[PDB]
Every structure is written in structure tokens, then in C-alpha cells.
Design a protein around this ligand. Structure first.
Ligand SMILES: [Mg+2]
Ligand SMILES: [Zn+2]
Ligand SMILES: [Zn+2]
Ligand SMILES: [Zn+2]
Ligand SMILES: [Zn+2]
Lengths: 523, 113, 131
């Protein structure tokens, strides 16, 4: 059994004078007589042979702790998002002097990029190998006619690795201290990687605290990702094996399974972006897991606290307004009451109940064609539930997915993957969800006494200049301060605005009105 | 200065074996041209060491043909796990013309060793 | 096309020396990392007569040792990888290597750990009158 690994690539079949062949196979049958080699003075050695050599058949999987085994297994690449970026390359074979080798020409990832490069390879020489540039042509397949205008305009390796590690150093610099890739057909990636990649001892980055995933050869320097400028190597990266995780056909038709929005404009980056997309599906289209966490990068606790306080506040307002006879909760995983004091009929629903308190969480999967004409009494709850059309009455809040939020990571199929502490595979946005309500109308509600020296009622409470007839925080007639209230609205205003920076959208039904709060405050 | 023939020779899978009866229904790869007379067949492609007969339903599906094969031509294609032996039988007594256009379309499709 | 070359059984081995940039300490950790040796060094043949200088144009051997080739004895060139050689490749490509009987299992660690002494031209310690 012989290897395509280091398999010679030039057509010349004249064996090497074994003093110029580093293996016992690359010796001509002039020296092997009964498995042994005998020196021959009858012919001198040769100095005229320039052959490229194959770089396939690797199967890298040593076993030491001094290097961490780069390829991560099933979970160790699912757990670690903010690193997913595609990897796929297109290749070709040579014409005259040689053929039988695979070399890269265009490289595409998850980033909407497709790098051009002239092919080069390890030619064998009587002193070592040289890294020589050889004539190139794409495969004779007619579907490679798109690959015609790429061979005469490519780029060498040095500038290419600089630009690539720098695309890294500005796109992934925001994300992680390594880099993981999705890959379908592992083989051509195996063949393509080696040119600007090197393994060795992972150590510590230069003047930085990350793990060193950059390497220089002129100096041997180790850069992270805020500090990789002209320093062009990916050193301890990662990958995620997409193919061997439950598939049959190619990635294209398996993208056609669910991922339909992904059109097919004839490029190469589409293959890696769809690799990432389909890997996202075949692990995350199911139920959200609560045992998985993430690093926070960043500022996320502000969004969390604002979301909690505003949700509680708006539910309080709608409740104390409309006086709901029954509030049919939906999709609440920890059976506690959002509003503390609420004399409303309290239920518990979800598509997946738990163990204890399942006597609360009833088994029900909502649908617009099924449960349409039952919960008309009172109101339900559609906070972050991503179903079909919302019923006639509901207090709602849906992630408008198209927003810009560098914690958003696109996925399948267009439905966004938000990366908080629990990865939300949330369905995309359309207008067909909110066809029974209208978006949120602003207000401000408070029902507590003041703090000033008056203690009792008007007019002994201090009014400082606050003029706004929309913050219905009585008392409110030109002053409307009460200290604790006014500034709070101030802060509260900030609160509201902050939410429109995440993506969550609030809507309340049309028949809501403002004067009910006014009449509530007529004490 | 005189180009030969841009092609349109299709390839299907069907039945062949070593004797009149040994032909299993799915093991061979027919290369053919649907001329004036049905899917007129030209050559066979296989992986087995030898197949001296083949069997294919007719134009409308009346009977099964008993078309013998050539002493196959030897060559090796490539599959992602290295080289792979393959044979190219011809329907015996097939002149140079269609042998040539078959080789054309074929070597076009399959890159050898 | 071309000519076949490596054994698939030592693929992994050369893999660790194909993608490595600190490949020397790497492959010595590999020799000591749960593996069996690179089972493909060119096996020469001679009368075992001559001095002990391995780096020889025509096998120059002792009665004890045994000769492999010259080129097939540096992993830096056995893997077609880049070299830290100043200018700019490895020397033993072209000659022969007669290693003494003990340490002659693998000539890679030999060529890298030892290096010819200018005095007796032999491998330093196998043997030498070096004081
Ligand atoms: Mg494509
Ligand atoms: Zn750094
Ligand atoms: Zn007040
Ligand atoms: Zn060397
Ligand atoms: Zn000495």
C-alpha cells in the first residue's frame, strides 16, 4: 500500500539515485537487489530534476498534552460559539511538466470573502525542496469554466496570508482567542491548509494575555487578534467537523432540506457559509438548552436588567389598566409570578413541561389553526414566543431579527442566532406575525407618594421644572416631579431606549388607550 | 484545422454478467446514443474482472437483449480513496468511429490515473 | 501521477513533522509520544570496511555499524518542510550514513541530536580520540 501523501507529481519516471531520495521506495530498481541497496559507481548522481510533490493523506492525530489536539470533537465545537467561521477552498492541477497534485486557488469562509491566489508548490530539488510557481489550469470539468479567469490573476502566499490573518484580526478580533471552522468534505481543506499554517507549542501571546494563534517566521513572534498587523499566521486554530454528524447527500441538497433562503449565486464562499448554516441546523434547530453558557462580550447585563424591569413594568401597567379576569401564562420555565401582586387567574403553559410543578405547566402546543377560539376570556402571554399569528389579545414582545447587534450570528434559515448566555435559535422576522395588534404606545406609570416636605396632598409637594404631558405619573399638571418619580422616568426613559438597541419589539393591541390611567389617578 | 465531433453520449446503469444468465440486473454502466433506433447502445463500463454478456430491455420493453461484450479495456479511475480498477467493454464488431466518440466523451467525463 | 513514496502507517508521524514549526522538539516528543518509528529508511549495503566516517561518497564503514543512505537521514528534508538552515538546506543530501550498531534504529534523531566532529569526522562519541 502506497501513499498519495508525498506522492511524486512530475511525469518523469526515472527513479532517484537513492542518495537523492529520502525514502526506500523512491529508489529505482537498479539498487534494490533482494531488498538491499548497493552503491553504484557505474553512473554518477544526478543534479537536474525539479518535481513538485503531493501534500495529501495526512490524518493528523498524534497524542500528547504538549500540543492540544486541534480537531475538537462533537461538543467542544458546539459549546463554543463566537468562533464559528467557514472554511472551504477550490483547487486545480498542473498541465505540462507535472500533474497529480491539489493546490488552492480561491479561499472562502463564513465572511463574505473569496480570496484569489496563484498556485505554488514544493518542488523537489537535489538540495531540499524549493517553493516554486508552476503553470496551472482548473479541472477539465465544464462547471469549472467559471474558474477560467482566476489562474492568470492570482496572488502569492506572503501578501495573501497577511491579508487573511488581518481579515481575521478585524472580523474575529471582536470574538474569540482561537478560531473554529465548519467543514464538509474535510479532504480538500486538509490539502489546502498547510501553506500559511503551522503547529507547535501553544504558549502566550506577545504583550497580550490571549493564547498565541499568530506566528512570525522572520522573528518568531506570537500575536493574538488585537495585535496581528503584518503578522500573518494562524497557529492554534480550531475547526468543527460538520460532515460526520448525521448526513447523507452533499451539503447543497441538504441545505435545500430546510435552508431555502440561501440562494445560489455562483461563488465559493457560499459553500463555507452554508457549511456553518447546516452545522447550525443539525445541532440547534431543536429545543434551547439551559445547561450551556457563554462568555459575555459584552455589556449584556444592562440589556438583561432593562428587559426584566420593562417587562414587569409593562405587564403591571396593562394589568392594573384593563383588569384582566384571567392571565393565561405561556412558556414560563420557573413557576414564579412576574408581577408580585396580581389578583388575576394564573395559569402555566408551555410546549415542554418539567418535572416538579408540571401540575402547573399544562401540555399544550399553540397554533393559530388549532387553539384560535378558546382563550378569548382575559388575555394570554406572548413574550419572546416565536409562533405564527398572534391571537386577538396578548401582551407581546418578539425579537425583530433583522436588527444590527454584533452578538447576532446569522444562521438557518435566515432566522437569527442570538448569542447571550443561552443560544437563541430564534425564527426570523416577518409581518405575518403581528396582524392582530399594533406596536407599543409609550406611557409612564407610577402609583406611590412623593418624598418632599409636604407628606400629605397638594399643594405642599415640591415641583421643579418638568414639562411633559406624556409621563402620566400623577400628580402631573406642569410640575410632575415628586423627586423619586421624575428622575426615575428619566432613568426609565433611558431604559426604554436601550431595548430598541437589542432587537426585541413591543406591541400592544389597538383598543388600548391612555385615559384609563388618567381616571385611575383621579384620587 | 478539422475538429471532429462535439458530443452528447449519455450513460446509464443496467444489467450484465459473464454468461447469458449470469447477468445481474444492476452492475454495468452503458454508454449509448439514442439514434433513429431507440437508445442504441455502444459500450459498457464496469468494475468486475470480466463480463461477457449483458441484458437490457428493448425500445418498448418486450424482451431482454443478449448483447455480448468485448475483452474489456483496462484502466484505473480515481475515487477519494485512491485508484480504482475499471474495465471498458465494447459491443463486439463496433467500428472505429463510435469507439472513438465513446472514448472522447468518456475520458472527458472520467479523469484516469 | 508521479511516483508513490510514503507508508500510510507512518503518515501520522510525518504529519507531525509536516505541520510543525518547532518540529525538532516536536518529533522527539513524538518518538516519545506513544508511537513506533518511521519504518522507511533506505537500507544500504557495503563490505563494512573503511573508517567510521558516515558522511562519505561511497560507503566508508566499520565491522560493527551499518549504512543507510545520506539524504534519507534528515527529517528537515525528509518532510520537504522549510529549514532553519542559514543558506538554506541540509547537508547530508547526497552521501551515505553508516551509523554504529546501537543508535542506528532511527537516523533522524541521530542527524539532529549528534553532528559530525571536525577532528575525526565521525559521530561525536562513536568513537573518538577527542581527549
Ligand atoms: Mg458553488
Ligand atoms: Zn496580542
Ligand atoms: Zn411623588
Ligand atoms: Zn535537512
Ligand atoms: Zn572527534
Amino acid at each position: 500500500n502506497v501513499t498519495g501523501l508525498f506522492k511524486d507529481c512530475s511525469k518523469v519516471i526515472t527513479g532517484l539515485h537513492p542518495t537523492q531520495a529520502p525514502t526506500h521506495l523512491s529508489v529505482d530498481t537498479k539498487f534494490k537487489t533482494e531488498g538491499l541497496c548497493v552503491d553504484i559507481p557505474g553512473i554518477p548522481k544526478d543534479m537536474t530534476y525539479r518535481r513538485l510533490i503531493s501534500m495529501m493523506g495526512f490524518k493528523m492525530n498524534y497524542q500528547v498534552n504538549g500540543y492540544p489536539n486541534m480537531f475538537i470533537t462533537r461538543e467542544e465545537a458546539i459549546r463554543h460559539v463566537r468562533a464559528w467561521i467557514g472554511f472551504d477552498v477550490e483547487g486545480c492541477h498542473a498541465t505540462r511538466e507535472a500533474v497529480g497534485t491539489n493546490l488552492p486557488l480561491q479561499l472562502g469562509f463564513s465572511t463574505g470573502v473569496n480570496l484569489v491566489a496563484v498556485p505554488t508548490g514544493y518542488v523537489d530539488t537535489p538540495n531540499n525542496t524549493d517553493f516554486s510557481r508552476v503553470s496551472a489550469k482548473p479541472p477539465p470539468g465544464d462547471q469549472f469554466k467559471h474558474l477560467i479567469p482566476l489562474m492568470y490573476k492570482g496572488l502569492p502566499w506572503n501578501v495573501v496570508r497577511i491579508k487573511i490573518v488581518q481579515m481575521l484580526s478585524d472580523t474575529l478580533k471582536n470574538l474569540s482567542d482561537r478560531v473554529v471552522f465548519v467543514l464538509w468534505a474535510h479532504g480538500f481543506e486538509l490539502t489546502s491548509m498547510k501553506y500559511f499554517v503551522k503547529i507547535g507549542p501553544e504558549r502566550t501571546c506577545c504583550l497580550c494575555d490571549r493564547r498565541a494563534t499568530c506566528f512570525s517566521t522572520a522573528s518568531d513572534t506570537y500575536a493574538c487578534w488585537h495585535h496581528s498587523i503584518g503578522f500573518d499566521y494562524v497557529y492554534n486554530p480550531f475547526m468543527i467537523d460538520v460532515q460526520q454528524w448525521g448526513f447523507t447527500g452533499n451539503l447543497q441538497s441538504n441545505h435545500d432540506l430546510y435552508c431555502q433562503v440561501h440562494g445560489n449565486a455562483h461563488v465559493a464562499s457560499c459553500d463555507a457559509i452554508m457549511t456553518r448554516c447546516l452545522a447550525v441546523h443539525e445541532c440547534f434547530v431543536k429545543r434551547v438548552d439551559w445547561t450551556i453558557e457563554y462568555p459575555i462580550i459584552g455589556d449584556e447585563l444592562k440589556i438583561n436588567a432593562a428587559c426584566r424591569k420593562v417587562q414587569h413594568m409593562v405587564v403591571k401597567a396593562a394589568l392594573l389598566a384593563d383588569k384582566f379576569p384571567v392571565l393565561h401564562d405561556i412558556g414560563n420555565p420557573k413557576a414564579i409570578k412576574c408581577v408580585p401582586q396580581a389578583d388575576v387567574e394564573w395559569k402555566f403553559y408551555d410546549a415542554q413541561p418539567c418535572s416538579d410543578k408540571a401540575y402547573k405547566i399544562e401540555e399544550l402546543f399553540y397554533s393559530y389553526a388549532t387553539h384560535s377560539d378558546k382563550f378569548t376570556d382575559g388575555v394570554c402571554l406572548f413574550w419572546n414566543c416565536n409562533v405564527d399569528r398572534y391571537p386577538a389579545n396578548s401582551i407581546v414582545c418578539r425579537f425583530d431579527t433583522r436588527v444590527l447587534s454584533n452578538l447576532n450570528l446569522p444562521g438557518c434559515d435566515g432566522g437569527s442566532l442570538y448569542v447571550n448566555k443561552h443560544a437563541f435559535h430564534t425564527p426570523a422576522f416577518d409581518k405575518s406575525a403581528f396582524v392582530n395588534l399594533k406596536q407599543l404606545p409609550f406611557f409612564y406609570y407610577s402609583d406611590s407618594p412623593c418624598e418632599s416636605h409636604g407628606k400629605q396632598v397638594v399643594s405642599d409637594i415640591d415641583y421643579v421644572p418638568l414639562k411633559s404631558a406624556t409621563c402620566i405619573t400623577r400628580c402631573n399638571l406642569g410640575g410632575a416631579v415628586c423627586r423619586h418619580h421624575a428622575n426615575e422616568y428619566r432613568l426609565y426613559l433611558d431604559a426604554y431606549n436601550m431595548m430598541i438597541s437589542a432587537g426585541f419589539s413591543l406591541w400592544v393591541y389597538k383598543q388600548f388607550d391612555t385615559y384609563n390611567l388618567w381616571n385611575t389617578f383621579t384620587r | 484545422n478539422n475538429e471532429l465531433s462535439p458530443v452528447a453520449l449519455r450513460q446509464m446503469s443496467c444489467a450484465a454478467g459473464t454468461t447469458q444468465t449470469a447477468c445481474t440486473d444492476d452492475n454495468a454502466l452503458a454508454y449509448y446514443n439514442t439514434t433513429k433506433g431507440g437508445r442504441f447502445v455502444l459500450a459498457l463500463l464496469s468494475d468486475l474482472q470480466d463480463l461477457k454478456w449483458a441484458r437490457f430491455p428493448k425500445s418498448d420493453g418486450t424482451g431482454t437483449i443478449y448483447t455480448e461484450l468485448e475483452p474489456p479495456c483496462r484502466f484505473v479511475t480515481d475515487t477519494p480513496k485512491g485508484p480504482k480498477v475499471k474495465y471498458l467493454y465494447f459491443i463486439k464488431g463496433l467500428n472505429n468511429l463510435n469507439r472513438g466518440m465513446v472514448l472522447g466523451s468518456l475520458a472527458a467525463t472520467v479523469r484516469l490515473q | 501521477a508521479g511516483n508513490a513514496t510514503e507508508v500510510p502507517a507512518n503518515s501520522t508521524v510525518l504529519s507531525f513533522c509536516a505541520f510543525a514549526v518547532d518540529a525538532a522538539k516536536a518529533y522527539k516528543d513524538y518518538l516519545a509520544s506513544g508511537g513506533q518509528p518511521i519504518t522507511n529508511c533506505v537500507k544500504m549495503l557495503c563490505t563494512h570496511t573503511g573508517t567510521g566516517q558516515a558522511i562519505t561518497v561511497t560507503p566508508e564503514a566499520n565491522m560493527d555499524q551499518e549504512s543507510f543512505g545520506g539524504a534519507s537521514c534528515c527529517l528537515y528534508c525528509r518532510c520537504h518542510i522549510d529549514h532553519p538552515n542559514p543558506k538554506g538546506f541540509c547537508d547530508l543530501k547526497g552521501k551515505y550514513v553508516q551509523i554504529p550498531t546501537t543508535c542506528a534504529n532511527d537516523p533522524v534523531g541521530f542527524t539532529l541530536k549528534n553532528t559530525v566532529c571536525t577532528v575525526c569526522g565521525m559521530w561525536k562519541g562513536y568513537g573518538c580520540s577527542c581527549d
